[PDB]
Amino acid sequence: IKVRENEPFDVALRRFKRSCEKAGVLAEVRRREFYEKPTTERKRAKASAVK
Amino acid sequence: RKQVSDGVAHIHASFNNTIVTITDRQGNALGWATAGGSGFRGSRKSTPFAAQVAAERCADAVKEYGIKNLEVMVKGPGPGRESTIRALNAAGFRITNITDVTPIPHNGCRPPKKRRV
Amino acid sequence: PRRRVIGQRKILPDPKFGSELLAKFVNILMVDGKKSTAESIVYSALETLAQRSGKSELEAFEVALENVRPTVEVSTYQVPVEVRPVRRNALAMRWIVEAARKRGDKSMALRLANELSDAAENKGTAVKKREDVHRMAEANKAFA
């Protein structure tokens, strides 16, 4: 989101975009309402997060 | 002509095409340029190169307004957008704000099915 | 090249001008293992090139070859990629020699002397090959 111009800068290099929206949240809402694949995608995501 | 001196660069990167619209702070468009209207139809209109030449071409065609400052508003994902704002400060603009204004529903409408490719 | 990174073998320089560049040019021109014939053609053709352009020998050659060196060259993508210098002048010589074999003059020394002379003011066939390569890599610039 917003980043004001600095007094002495060439590149703003805002990381605001990365910490939230671009990578996951919009690519997720491109495709189908299931209820079913998310229960198993989250099941195997939390079953993969193991030592 | 009309000498606005500050605007907003609405860049609308999608997966297939980036479309850059330079406007004023009221929201009235002053001139636009798409990646698909700069040659390279098809698999090549969704690249960072096509977006940057789209932004170069949208920096042209607003010379009649004397824009020096502009905010950048970014929609959608895309191979564009990042390169796009680069082309803007390669065209003498003082880039002030970079907001990302991608529309995110708060679980609204059902998205389409697709793609068993 | 699957595994083996390689060295390279050292060519003897030219017996008239000491130029390994021109030595590789007589190797590009040589057919059927006949090197004497090819160096005769190169000495005659570049000798009339030095007489025609009036510059000198291998700076007339180096200008005429400087106008034909490619800059960059090209799902099925044709990506543009930057040419290495040894490959750069290797392609230069291959295009000069090939275009000189295409010409319709009398002797090979006249075909290649006229091809290097047509490349000195960059209007020959090898410059059309270089402009063709550069149109392919210029059209497809969108892949890097």
Added chain:
RNA sequence: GCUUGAGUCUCGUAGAGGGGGGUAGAAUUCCAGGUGUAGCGGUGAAAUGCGUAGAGAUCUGGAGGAAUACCGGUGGCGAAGGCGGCCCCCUGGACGAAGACUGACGCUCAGGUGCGAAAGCGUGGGGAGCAAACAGGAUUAGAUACCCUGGUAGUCCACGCCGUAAACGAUGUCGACUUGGAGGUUGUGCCCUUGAGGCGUGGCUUCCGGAGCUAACGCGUUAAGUCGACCGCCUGGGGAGUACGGCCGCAAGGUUAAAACUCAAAUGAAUUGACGGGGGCCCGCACAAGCGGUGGAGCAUGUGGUUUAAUUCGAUGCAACGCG
């Protein structure tokens, strides 16, 4: 009679448990208007489609419907199906702490009754998105598909029906006993709290494992271990959960449920290999980078075929075809 089973009362706790009502913010679509101009959309690539009657982009105002990002978690609640913004109203259960009370009031359950995703059906609304059917464009040998552009029922609400699912921990309910470890979640007591305290005691739950069991795989105090009570169901594969009959249902169909005939297997788990348009690593003139050929011409020679009295026999993907 008695309290160790079951239940009642007191006080709290956590919770997407249920039903009714209201509201909020993002976003999609549509409508009206401003700017603005040549494309937009889409794909592996395209085209159909939308667009100089001004689209797409962008700003303002409005309408409407559905769903409720982040929190969000092998987190929670529910008998199961299932339940996710926030607020109110009505309401069910669970768990914990101390004490009091009843006093075996318990467990299971054929028939019976209730609840029961989704799709579907009936009547009446609603209809933004999505989308069976359908239409067009592609792809293809074909493409009644996958992909693209549209798109109706439906999905949403009220009431009634249906009555099923891989309705699944493929594991009936209730109770007892039998080594451990790491967590999560929700109670609570005690003790310098003198941290990111310590020490205990319950409820639910996740992962790994011991004995034991198991065909093996695995289960493993939430058992598939060791027992008890009651219920449901099984008896080779197919035919067949089908036909006939009954009951139910508006219908779709649901439920109960055969036989003739036919096969000598069908099946489970695991092993070795092979294979994969599975994954990782690696090689070879394998590809790439090049140079010269073959396929075109004439001839040489071998072969197939044809011919012949015979055209001797053998070699025939690679690895037969100037081969024996």
